[PDB]
């Protein structure tokens, strides 16, 4: 079919590889950034192998993140469907569905609270990607595709990757992306579309009767004028989720899995603490960031003593390299939260960074005092020409 | 369309061509050359397809302060080289010439073997204005029977007219500022230049390697090795007669002391950026002087950035204390890796002492600047961004 030939064309496949590349570089993990580089090292034959297998309708190549051949096929399947299929173009353009962004949902949440949304319930659909009915998804997609090859490809994308997105795998994504939920949408490009197809009825039913429901994949936020309205909304949501064999964490019985109460006091949403007036990274996100920085400064502190005594020190953690990589870690994290207006927590984080940097600077000075020139070279991270020749 | 020209236009050979062009850009120290390759990489799908498409249409306008050839021109030249050397008998033959270079380290290795077997004297010269005085029609004349494909032949001619024939003495001096061994820059900036030189000087290579005279040539730099000063003088005059046959010449060391060398091999001589002596191979004095000047430039930029980042809040960050020590470290890595075939340890130690000394000056200047400074100045000076500046 024209639909399947569009997925097999190297134009859309190569076009999908760039999106997979960006989603990887937006992550802190070096292994994910280097995995894209090796696939890139075979760029001509590596994507033609995918194209050839799709033409033969052989999907065995799909077997914390999905493999790049799997990740590219998912991205290539999405772009074609959203510009060729009316339903896919429709569910991805849902006003209350975000993912195909976090800043938009939080901006909409903030706007609602500024305009009467004084109470909220924020919950999650537990075990969403494992409890969703694979056969209902294919059922809802079959007439809109009219291509059993594309349907089987979508079916194999779910079986190999999407249905395996469990809570253990999601926790691995949180330590990789600054806003953890953005990892699912980018390690599995079909997950936003998969959730939008399965919860399209849920979205339509929940945005009514003065209740706003903002949803990002399987995380949703109910906003209302009174506590009674959001309480009625949550029970209405449990029934809608129950129609398709799903549930949601009750904030009244699972205090740590869901939130409930006034919006004026603030609540966590998509990795940020959202008040009607203040938007900042959540306490859990900042704790994760301070722990990431501590590990780099600890590694830099050990390398000061190692490079002063030994000549096989890894330059990656030398003084120049460590300060260089910590700078990039700060750049990547701050850029992910440029939509936030909380200046106090950023300055508090800056004081934490400057404090540990002062500890490292003072430690370097004490070690390099009365040291010889070659020791200063290994500690600061500037190679000796004689070592390269030896 | 012939199978030879379809091979050049295939994206597979165009991809292996650009991967080498990308690699050669990183082997250069110039940040502009490394970032120019990234801009062509920013359009990776359509950038190489535009070339593939225009080649199939035989439209070569895309080949048109720039020291290297443009990346589309550089890619096509590399693709033309890869296809020719594995398909044409002459091209694989002239590239596999024993006395033609097989990197610089092999030419220097062959020079040591000649000295090891009796070459007590030498003459090292250059063919001046080689690429501008090269005859376009003689090149096509030597290639036309071995190709049998006018499409590939006209593409070779347009590569010469747009890039190779414009490699003049002013542009070569720009290549020395970029690569540790300056003559390697010609091969990296214009991939077809070694093949073009080997095709043009094939008769010269055959005539010179005779009568007990070893002739080692790298593009347009050549070295004559013989048992006596009389032998290499006879050989140099034989080289002038051969170069005069094709409207070329070579610098006479007897009249141009600074353009060519002549004398005993035991006292040492400069060849391909290296000083070659009986047992000591090391970077030449000009190569070491050019390297110290590059390090001086980075430390000057690092020194000025300490003063700038301490006074102003729009610092580049590229030359901050951590970033400067980082790039200088890599500059030292790239320069040292290029002379791993050398065995002269005293000059590597002398350069290390030079590096350690400039590093001590910079560390002392940073200490005086950061003394009695606040935390925000130390952040800009050391090269650790502020989270509050990103959010603003």
Residue numbers in the entry:
A (entry chain B): 2 to 64, 81 to 117, 122 to 411
B (entry chain A): 1 to 64, 79 to 115, 121 to 411
Passage from the reporting paper:
Bacteria encode a variety of reverse transcriptases (RTs) that evolved from mobile group II intron RTs to perform different cellular functions. In a previous study, we showed via genetic and biochemical analyses that a Pseudomonas aeruginosa group II intron–like (G2L4) RT functions in DSBR via MMEJ both in its native host and when transferred into Escherichia coli. Here, we determined a 2.6-Å crystal structure of a full-length G2L4 RT apoenzyme and a 2.8-Å cocrystal structure of G2L4 RT bound in an active conformation to a snapback DNA synthesis substrate and incoming dNTP. All RTs share a common structural framework composed of fingers, palm, and thumb or thumb surrogate regions that fold into a hand-like structure, forming a cleft containing an RT active site composed of three conserved aspartate residues that bind catalytic Mg2+ ions.
Unlike group II intron RTs, which typically appear in crystal or cryo-EM structures as monomers, the G2L4 RT apoenzyme structure revealed two monomers per asymmetric unit forming a symmetric dimer, a difference verified by size-exclusion chromatography comparing G2L4 RT to a closely related mobile group II intron RT (Geobacillus stearothermophilus group IIC intron RT, denoted GII RT). Continuous density could be traced for all amino acids, except those in two putative loops (Q65 to R78 in RT1 and G116 to D120 in RT2a). The two G2L4 RT monomers that form the apoenzyme dimer have nearly identical hand-like folds composed of fingers, palm, and thumb regions (RMSD = 0.83 Å for main chain carbon atoms), but lack DNA-binding (D) or DNA endonuclease (En) domains found in group II intron RTs. The thumb domain of G2L4 RT is similar to that of GII RT in being composed of three parallel α-helices (α1-3), but differs in extending straight up for 41 Å, 15 Å farther than in GII RT, and ending with additional short α-helices (α4 and α5) that interact with the thumb domain of the opposite monomer. RT2a is nearly identical to that in the GII RT cocrystal structure, but with a hinge region (G116 to D120) that connects to RT2 and is disordered in the absence of bound substrate. The structure of the RT3a plug and its binding in the active-site pocket of G2L4 RT are stabilized by an interaction network that includes salt bridges formed by two conserved arginine residues (R190 and R191) that are located within the 9-aa insertion and form part of the first α-helix of the RT3a plug.
